[model samples]
Target chain A: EDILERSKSTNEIIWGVKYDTRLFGMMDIESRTVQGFDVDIAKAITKKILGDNGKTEFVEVTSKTRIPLLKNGNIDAIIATMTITDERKKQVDFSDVYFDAGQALLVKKGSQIKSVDDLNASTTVLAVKGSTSAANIRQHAPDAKILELENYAEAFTALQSGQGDAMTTDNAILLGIADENPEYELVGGTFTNEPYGIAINKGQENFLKAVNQALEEMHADGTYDKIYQKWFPNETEGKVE
Target chain B: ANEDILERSKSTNEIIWGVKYDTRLFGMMDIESRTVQGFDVDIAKAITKKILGDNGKTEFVEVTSKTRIPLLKNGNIDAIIATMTITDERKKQVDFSDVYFDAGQALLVKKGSQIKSVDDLNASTTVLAVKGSTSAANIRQHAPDAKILELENYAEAFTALQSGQGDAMTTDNAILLGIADENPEYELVGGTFTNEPYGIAINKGQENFLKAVNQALEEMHADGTYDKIYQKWFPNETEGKVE
Candidate 1:
């Protein structure tokens, strides 16, 4: 209750956001504004929970730092496309799945390495440091040598520059990379379904429930679909009823 | 003179909606509070906002599957957001928005019933369904040898199923979920053998109105509003759309 009051009084919900992924939570280079499915969802939820007058202060956090910042009370909640794993659940409570995520492989167009299985000890796959994709691929591709880098952009650039045979990550993130340059294509369709949910502190049941209800309000009002449309307009157009 | 539903609704500021008072998740009445609420009701709320803006109001007139079409065709309501499925036969009479819900036909049986799937039913099987709805006719085709019993409404059919009026009950799983939720002795079985996608229905030939409705639906979905409302009621159900 006081959290809502403080948020309303201060007109801010300290949100830990990401500025990298194209569709998920990327920051526009030209406009210098953070806009994507994740950012838009966070703003809409802020209004629903803290009234339309509520505002958000985006605090950039990477996969490595996001959990610790939340644990240290540096942010109120996280709306990044953070995967809901049992390990993360122990750190912070999660709202229902806001988006579906899956791990997949992205490779050069006609590369001999066709799918995840094609890679072996001789094949090198580039992944990002501090990403579930990195850890997830290791378990699945034990025979393949892995190169973990700083972020998706670097890992993808490395793949194009011939640092590795292929790149692997959640299909959502890879889809953005593939969209930027058609020279690359996603291979070996999603091997695992990774459900993405909002993470909150564990003891905040009221906050968790309110957040879920806010998500419900967003869904009821069509804000959620509109965000998806902004990114993938053609695919979402023919399906609404 | 065109009986423009859009202009009529704008002038009156009321979008009269044709919805069911029986179906659970889609449309069902709360008699104690004198209000109707569910997924369909929430969908209509968004529709009203999209069509009439934030101040728009709705007037819901209760209807059944069979009669909803008649009322919709005659302009008794501006639109019907009931549990109406987008079917080839229904499409001949009403224009539908894109698929709002991916519904299908399934059966409700007890936990210990020998019927594991629709294939288990044979010649002597009795299946209960709603009258003048798609499921009644569909059961005949899916289980050709079974005898189907059609009742006037879902509640009555559920009662019949409880009393052994039939070996199982069949309807759109969207409706059956609510029935199965309220009834402890019964559970949904056979996993959706027929796909009965639901759509928002309007009188045939209403091009402008159809376009606006579709626009509203599209916007709602794109914004992530539709998914949130869906999870509110059907959180446990593991199904979603991926573009």
Candidate 2:
């Protein structure tokens, strides 16, 4: 009911449609606005699909709740940094991948542990619970013991406490950690590729196809690159392929 | 005696050889002198000896995940012996010598995780993998239902695993052991799932040179030199047949 009320309130202000925050660049407090690279891409998409007055609003969300909110119709579309894996595609249709990310290890600057080889030497590594990243670490450094914390903040704190030699997660999340703590650094190379896409209800193939076309168009016209540079200018500037 | 083989082999000898300088057992840089050593260096030198003889000189090219294969195909290196695996898909682009080293796919998991095999993975369980690796393919075959995330290389995969990105890291056991050697808190779970044979990759269609290289490999195996070399680097972990 609270969710519905919030959704209703948002709809009243922006009308009828809600955006899932997890969609790559939908909502960021740092920028002091709901607009992000993904949001702009979504708006462009809305204009293409429903014309200029598509009646969409954005809502903040986490990785855990993005799918559930969309399932319950709390959001009309999700343009978050959601991955388009085969398993995920079964539950909800995804637009073509708009962004690419992967798991990375973030460590304290100049830490002795430089790469996976360092982690495998019987040291403890920290990870956030319920995130796909933990499994990524275990898969690569099976012999290294893993300590799971509640969230990214706690994980960073654990690194500060020397509870673990390093902290691991997605490159984007690690960038967030790096942004907050200049003392930390992202070590190793990208271990996995997680391509981000917009999410729609399972039956919304038409919407999915339209979103994909809009994303491709955005990529072709340099709009996507421009928007990505806006938020992650330093980190993602030379990374776009 | 063989003109075509000699020509191809001579051409490769003149070109640089790209090898890893970070892999502990295979290739690694000695911190003090900044010199690269390990099995890859040894194997490349041995092959060079057979092709170029005692007076043949070759340069060692430092290659990483991002640069090795690209450098080779672009004519920067004549061959690569950086623990590269032989696969049908890879053979399409580059030629591989006869299998010199064999590894198997294995899982590195947390001690208490319920994931015992690839079949145990679900949408909820994230799997870490290096981008463009045979283990990634092994995971797809073994755990078709699981979400396999691709990273840039083994180093990143290990970091992701440590950071709790996935439930298990799947890769060649040798590479996993390297990870374990560095991070002792974790253990390898669910033994091997696939066979991965390491081969020296040369440019495609270098059949004559490939045959000559295979001859050298056969001689190395028959003379017990291969085992001696293997024992030098992997005395503790080597359990499979090199031949």
Candidate 3:
């Protein structure tokens, strides 16, 4: 309590966001304003715990930097579409998974790779280094050759230039890529569900509960769906009768 | 003396909820199960656990669209989750949580009914609608010449439709789908017209309590809880005709 309280004394609630992803988080080239579902969720958390006027300094964090930044307090908390796995749980605590994504394949519109079943030794899959997708591909399509790249953008470029037959990652990130380019689409429904949660330093129980509570309210209130429909404008919603 | 609704619920150990026992999918009763079951019931259960303990005590009070406000204002029910819509006029009487479900007006007509669409209905066509609901009124404006008979509840309206007493039953698509689900003879047709966002209702006051309910819903959406519940009741929704 005292650790975060003292920082609150400064009157600004600092947090981390991703500047690359299109919908979850993005930095506008012209406006330079950080926008997306994740950035708003982070701001929402700030308003609840830090007060209505609670301000923020949005710091940029990468896939590799998220854990390090939070552990050392470079940023108070993070909502970077980070997946929660049993392994990561040992290093840092996580709030309830706020967004549920899944692993899927991205390929050219007319590509032969219709689904994961079409992949084998005859194909190659590109993914970012240290991404859980690498392990997922190995288990799901062991014979397929795997090519690891620096990040999503680089990996996507490799796929575009024919370095690999397909790109594999969380469906949300792939959707971002598909949104920017007209030539590609996510193939097959999500195979492995990737639950995304807010990353916090270990032992922040109250903070965890507060984030989950805020997220729940967002869903109940319809704000979450608004943000969802904004980012995923054409996405299919629950068609429950 | 200054306790909020959350504290009051815990202190009393009984969270009072207002619900409709008629509308299927939102709130309905299964005679075999002898219990009310639907989306609203699940939402209310989750809200109770969120505000109270997992073992929290929740008692539901029967309420119709006309009776809900009185029950809430008179302190008979702490909250209303009876497929109520969020509208400007109602906001004056009570506070509403963010919309839990998005709904719209649609029609359930007998499979062979000559009524191809709302446009097909004219002065001679009679439409069955639930009493005191915005959809009932909204449908009125859509087909001004049609004879509209207001029924007491959704079951009554559906029954009246089956008996050939009315040409079609009109309500939000969510409720119409439920009636159609149980009765294959009638199906939702002519598509939806009005935008009806369903919200949880509480008496005007209790900001903290309202926030708590919203929080539970936000969590439900973000997590897989809401998805599971939606999929359970709506397995065929993935097939199509969902809004």
Model 3: per-residue Cα lDDT over B1-243, one tens digit each: 134678777568777888888877777777998788888888788778767767888787788898999988888788999988777678888889866665666778999777755655678999999887776787678788888888987778888999999998888777888777788888876545455667888887688888888888778766767667777766755311111
Off by over 4 Å in 1: A1-241, B240-243
Which regions of candidate 3 deviate over 4 angstroms? A1-4, A236-241, B1-243
TM-score of 3: 0.52
Q: DockQ scores for all the models shown?
A: 0.02, 0.01, 0.03
lDDT tens digits, residue span A1-241, model 3: 5335645687665677888888888898889799888888787767766678888789999988989998888887888978766578778878765665667789998987756756889999998888788988898789999999998889999999999999999877898899889899877545455667788888776666666777777766776767676677775321111
Query: Candidate 2 on A1-241: residue-level lDDT in tens?
Result: 3332332344321211223222234345677657555666666666555555554666766667778878787776676666666567567777655665666677888876655655775799898787677877887789999999976668888999999988887677577668778998876545555556677777755556666676667666877777777767775411233
Query: What is candidate 1's lDDT per residue for A1-241, written digit by digit as tens?
Result: 3455566678888888888888878888888888777888888888888887888888887888888998887888888878776567668988866765567788988876645656779999999986778887787778998999999889988999999999998777788888888999876444455667788877777777888898877766888777767776643211222
Worst 10 contiguous positions by lDDT, candidate 2 chain B? B1-10
In model 1 chain A, the worst 10-residue window by lDDT is A232-241
Displacement of the residue B40 alpha carbon in candidate 2, Å = 2.0
The best candidate in terms of DockQ: 3
- Of candidate 2 chain A, the 10-residue stretch with the lowest lDDT total is A12-21
The best-first sequence of candidates by lDDT reads 1, 3, 2
* Chain A TM-scores in order: 0.92, 0.80, 0.93
Q: Is candidate 1 or candidate 2 better by DockQ?
A: 1
C-alpha local distance difference test of each model: 0.77, 0.68, 0.77
